Amino acid sequence: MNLCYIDGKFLPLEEAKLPVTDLIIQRGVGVFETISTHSRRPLMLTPHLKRLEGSATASSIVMPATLDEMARIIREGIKKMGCETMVLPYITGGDSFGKDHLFSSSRYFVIFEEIRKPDPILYEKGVALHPINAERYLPSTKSINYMLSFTGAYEILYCPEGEIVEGSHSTFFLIKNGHLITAPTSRALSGTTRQIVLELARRGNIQVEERCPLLTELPEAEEAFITGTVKELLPVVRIGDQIIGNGVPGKLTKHLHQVYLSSIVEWLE
Template sequence: MTLCYHEGQFRPLEEIFVPLSDLAIQRGIGVFESIRTYDRRTFALGPHLERLARSAEQAGIEARNLIPQVRDILREGLARPDCPQGEVLMKPYLTGGDVREEGRFPHPRLFVLFEPLHAPDPNLHREGVTLQPAAMERPFPLIKSINYLFGYIPVAGMEGVFETLYCPGGEITESSSSNFFLCVEGKLVTAPVGRVLSGVTRGIVLHLAREGGFKVEERCPKVTELEKADEAFVTGSLKEILGVVRIGGHRIGKGTPGPVTQHLHRLFRTSLQHWLD
C-alpha cells in the first residue's frame, strides 16, 4: 500500500485526489523529489530538501512555508504503522495549485507519497544498460519537474532501452532521470550543474572520485568521445551507480560495466552511513 500525506492527514493513496483545477493537471506545473531509505533511515535528506526548495523557487512555486514541514512529515510518516514495510521511497510533490499570478504560483499543494522501494534489477548492475541518444536538451535543467514527457517520447516503443540520453549539439548532458558520466582517456567527465540537474548522488560520486584520486572534468562530454571511451555510467538515488554498456549504436568499452564503475559503486556503498539521517 502507498501512504500519502496531504493537508495535515496521512491516508491511503486511493483516498487522495488532485483537483482538475490544479495547474499540475492543467499545465504540468509541479516539482518533486525522490528520497529513499537505507535501513529505514533517509538518504541525503538535507541536499534533497535544498534542491526541492531551489526547484520550487525557479519554477515560481511559492513554497517557502511548506518546505520546512517536509522533514517532520517524512519522519512521522516513516514511523506510522500503515507506512510500507521495508525500504521506502518518499516523494514530496509541490503542485502549481489553482492560481497563477504574474507568472508565479502563490498557493501550491503539498503531497508526500510513501511507497515501497523497488530498486533496479541486480542484473542491470551486472550487465549494464543501454541509453538512446536524442539530439535535444532537457528544458529548465535546474528544476526537478514533474513533467517527464520530453524524456519518454524518444524511447517510446523501443525495447531494451533504459533511458533517453540528451545530446544537444554534439554534447552529452544527462539522461532522462539520471546524471551521466563518461570515463575517457583516464578522466571522469560529467556535465556541469547549470547544463544538468544537480543530482544528489552525482555530488556524492564526484566527492568520492576526487577523494579517491580520480581526475575529474566537469564539462559536457562530446558524442565523438564515445568511440574511445572506456566506460560510462549513470547515477541516481534508486539506481545508485549503474554501468552503461551501449549508447545507440556505440558499444562502450568492452560492453560490460567496467572497473571504474564497479570501484566507485563499492565506495558509494561503503560510505552510505555518512549520508543517512
Template structure:
C-alpha cells in the first residue's frame, strides 16, 4: 500500500492536501530527499538526513521536526505500508503564507510519500544505457537538493525523447553530472568523477562508490574533465539512489566497450552493501 504523510499525520497518497498558497507550490521554495529502502531497511539513512539538514541550512530553512522525529515518522510509515522495497520521498517547504518574495513568519511544512520502489530493468543494468550530452542550464548552487528542478526535467525529457536514459550536462566545456545522477569514468585503470563543488549534487551513492573504490584500492581521482576525455574513456557509469550503479554503453555517437571490469566490480560491491 502506498501512503503519504503531510503536516502531522498520515493521509491517503491520492488526497489533495497542498494549499494554493504553499511556498513550495508557488516558488519551489523548499528541499527534498529520496531514500531507498531494501527489505524494510532504509539504506544510508543518516547520510540522506544529514544532506537534508545541509540543504535546509543553505536556503535558511528551519526544519519542522528534529532528525530523530523524522526517523520516527519514517519507521511508522514503513510499518504502515505493505512494501519492503520502498522509495521514500521527503519534501520540506517554507510553509503556507500569502504569496510574497520575502520569507514569511510561519512554520515550514513536511510531506512524505512511501511508494513501491522503482526497479531498473535487468537488461539495462547488464548491457548499459545510452546518454546524450547537453548544455548545463541550471543555477550555480546545484549542491542544494532544492525543488527547483525544471532545467533537470527539461534535460531528462529531451534525452528520453531522443531515446536516451540520461542527459549528461556540460558547463563551460566541462562535464558536471547527469540531470538526475552523478557520472564516473574509467580511463587506463583509474576512476574519475567531477569534484564535489557547488556545481553538482553531492550524491549519497556517489560517496558510497568512492568509499568502495578506496577500499578496493582502485586508483581514484576527483578531476574536472571535458567532453573529449569523457568520449575517450574506457568505461563510464552513472549513480543515484534509484539507479545505483548503472553502466553507460553509448555517449551520443560513441560506443563504449562492453568489457567493463571496474564498473561491474563496483556494481556488485555496491549491491553487497544492502543485500
C-alpha cells in the first residue's frame, strides 16, 4: 500500500492532505525529487537530496527539515513498503512569502509508491517525443510546474528556437557518429541518470559533446534516448515527424543501458 509521510507520521497515501492555504496549491510554489530503488536501496540518495536543497534555495524556500532527517524518513518508508519503491519528497512554499522575500513556513511530505517502470515494450520499440518551442525557466530547479508537459508522444521535448534542451522529466541524449550529444547544465537540469551516463561514456571512451543537439541535426542522427531514475535509459525512435536513424532502438543505447544496470550498485545508498 502507498504511503505518505506528513506531520511526523506515515499515512496511507490516499488519507494524506495539505492545507489549501499552502502556496504550492495557490501559486505553484514547490520543489521535489524522484528517487527510485534497486534491490530496495535508494539510487543516488545523497545527490537527489542535495538537488532538493538546491531547488528549495533557488526558489527562496527555507528547508523545513535537514537532509539527514529526510534521508531517515526515506529509508524508513522504503523499509515499510517492502518492495522496489519510487519516493517523492516535496517541499512546499507554505502559507506566506515574507518581507525578506523567503518562504519561511515551508511544509514537506514524502510519497512512497510501488515503482512503475515503463512497459518492457517501450524499451523494445522506443518512444516518441513531442518538440515544443519553449524552455524551462530556472532550469537547474526541479519545480512542481508540469502543466506544459500535459496540455502520440511519451513526453514533451523543450526545443527553444530549435535547440534541444531536455524533456519535462528526462535528460535528452542524441547519438551522432558514435558521439553522445547532450545539453550542458547551464541549460538542462543536472540529472543524476545524466551524471551516471556521462561517467559510463568516460569509462567506454565514448566522446560526449555537452551542447544542445539541434532539430536540424536529427536526420543525420543514428540514435536518441531519454534518462531519469525510474525510466533508466529509454530509447527515442521519433521526435515530432522525424524518425531517428532506422526507427528502432540503437546498439549504443542498448549497450549503455546494459552497462548502467550492471554498474548501478556503485551508486546505491
